[PDB]
Amino acid sequence: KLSVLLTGFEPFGGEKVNPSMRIVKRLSKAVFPHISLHTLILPVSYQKSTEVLEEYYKTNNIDIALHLGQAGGSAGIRLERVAINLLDSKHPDNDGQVKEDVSIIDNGPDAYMTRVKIKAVAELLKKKKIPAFVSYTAGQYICNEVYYYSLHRSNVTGTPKHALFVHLPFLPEQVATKEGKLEKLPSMTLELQTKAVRLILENLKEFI
Amino acid sequence: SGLSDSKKLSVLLTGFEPFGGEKVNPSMRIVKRLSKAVFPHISLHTLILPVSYQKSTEVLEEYYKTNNIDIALHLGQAGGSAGIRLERVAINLLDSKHPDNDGQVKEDVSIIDNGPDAYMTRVKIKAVAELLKKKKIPAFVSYTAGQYICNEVYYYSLHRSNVTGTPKHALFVHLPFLPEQVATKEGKLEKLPSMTLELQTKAVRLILENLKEFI
Amino acid sequence: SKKLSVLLTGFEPFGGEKVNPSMRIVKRLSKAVFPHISLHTLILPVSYQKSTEVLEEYYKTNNIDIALHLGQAGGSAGIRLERVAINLLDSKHPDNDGQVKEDVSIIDNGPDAYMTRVKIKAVAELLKKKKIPAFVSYTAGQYICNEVYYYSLHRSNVTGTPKHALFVHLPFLPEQVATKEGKLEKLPSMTLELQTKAVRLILENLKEFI
């Protein structure tokens, strides 16, 4: 069976929840007959995100990495095609660290594209009535960092064989607390986001 | 009256038929869902209106003549809106380049000749928004409901309320696209906001359950 | 004495900004010669109490046919012609006097709203034909800008002066976006030169709108 590592991130930036973590916790209680599902919550940390992830790859054989992250302001399931070799944000991570114009892997390639059939994923989700679309920038923060890490490791070691990053809307509860014009941000219920990630897992063979 | 503060509120909940190429309308679906009016403090009426400049208010007026209504809670689709959009203002104007479902186009037409330029709801609209947010539902107050059929019905009810006393109150609630309506969109429109039917229904349910605190 | 008497107003900077496009346009056009109208100019404070006081004193002392009020609408991308003024003060943000108003009428038992009687769609069409992005808006907010607009349309209804009022919301100047951090660095703007031309075009064509 396919070995799948499904990851999410802890809350950050003053949020009390992270949709990626809530989805991972919900799906950790789910049995899929065609895959062996590993789950892992990563820290929002430039240093520790990839240390934790590398330690998991070292101790477990993973065929496919499915990384989830929060993309506040996005309105649909945001499938990321591109990971770039750069850390860059004015905002600190959860360790208080700030990175500006820093490579992830010195003399690594400038970027990787996923080898997953990402448009087929978007099409499957839309046919199941879930808003979904392909994005070409996953940012330059921890989410992109973990994505680039997995695609680079996949390129150099062959493990994981594939990696895909799925950015997620705010949960409605995260927007309900927002002040000013941010009270009008998009959201998607946890039930629908969970269904979307479940559909990806149930149909994984069609995408690799 | 002689009833003092003990009468059951009669509530008219309306939605609209699909329009603009959509096969569904979230307002119509919520009204159908809430059709099973298990509410302890209200007598719930429901009505689906046509998206038609002429017939929308005729059908609505026909219902107002044949039933007694205390509060009109009008629901409508606001494609592109991300949260429960509580409308505070109805204006005396029909104006859109888009035809209604009968093929009529209205441009800069008064709704009620020599009616006021606009009405604001007298419902405690900020308290509705605050209740929904506290229940973890995105919601906000809007000051334009457009100049299409939704605004028209809103103005009609607030004007009829001012001159006749019936209904006593009116509120219009604009609603996001359902996720299935965005899932079919082309190009950049695939990125529009949506809200599940379950959450939209919960929002309208909460307004109905807490109506006393808003009027 | 007999040309069209026009009052053009703008507002002082507010909200941490050091400039306001409305003020800059009024300053530029106060220096211009308009041969076919009598142009009055006035910079108003961003103050719930003092904005309409200063405005009222000008109306008391000068006969004004049309009031053309300008204001900043940070985030808007074109010339934003306001059709509706509503009888409400409501914002979490203080004015420049530190005063906050939530859910209060402007005029006790005034109408809920006024629409301009200016031919506002014709204004939008003229600007577009002159290659200037412009559109009609149905909410001018509930802050000082809307307050002044409602004040003028109410005064016009109750006293007859001014005969007309129109409110024009304006994009940020590019220098106001150039200072912004985070995602606000991507906000729309319009140069002072183009904003000034738009307002000049409205003033030059006023006969066609009233």
Added chain:
Amino acid sequence: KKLSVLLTGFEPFGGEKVNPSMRIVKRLSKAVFPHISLHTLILPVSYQKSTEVLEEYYKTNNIDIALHLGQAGGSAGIRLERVAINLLDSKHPDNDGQVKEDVSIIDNGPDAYMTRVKIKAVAELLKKKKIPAFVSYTAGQYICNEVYYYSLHRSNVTGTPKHALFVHLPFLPEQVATKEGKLEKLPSMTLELQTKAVRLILENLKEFI
């Protein structure tokens, strides 16, 4: 005079009568800079011919820096592109009517290149001169990205050009003024300000390489 600079724009496309990139290049094609030898070139909006025309110019001329301009309708500021990806992909035809879906630009070329120009310093200079400007990490998958990827790939394998940077541009106000429906509210930037932005980049080029 020292740096050989190729400034490019694109022809109108998608139903427009103008392209801001083309107008800027025409306006600047007479401009003399004491530190630069300025080449100008208008490229077709064509998957096939854009890089053919560009390759022919590189083959016959010694270019140090390519500064590519393009239209990004809907963008509000000077949009400095950091990333070119190895992909042609759009629902929309080019001006020759061809459609490309998930086609590599360079077979087994790298998935993407980032510019080696000091792009954050370019953004900071523009902002200090009171011009809205920001760094973008996707230039699309149409002709603009195609030309960008071509130049960065050519730079990596041949050394010519030494550097390339792509600058996406807002609509001109005249392009939004013709728009119907909700598109009448799109952002724009006058030709005068866009031209000043590109002029400032050229004037300060040594700061960025």
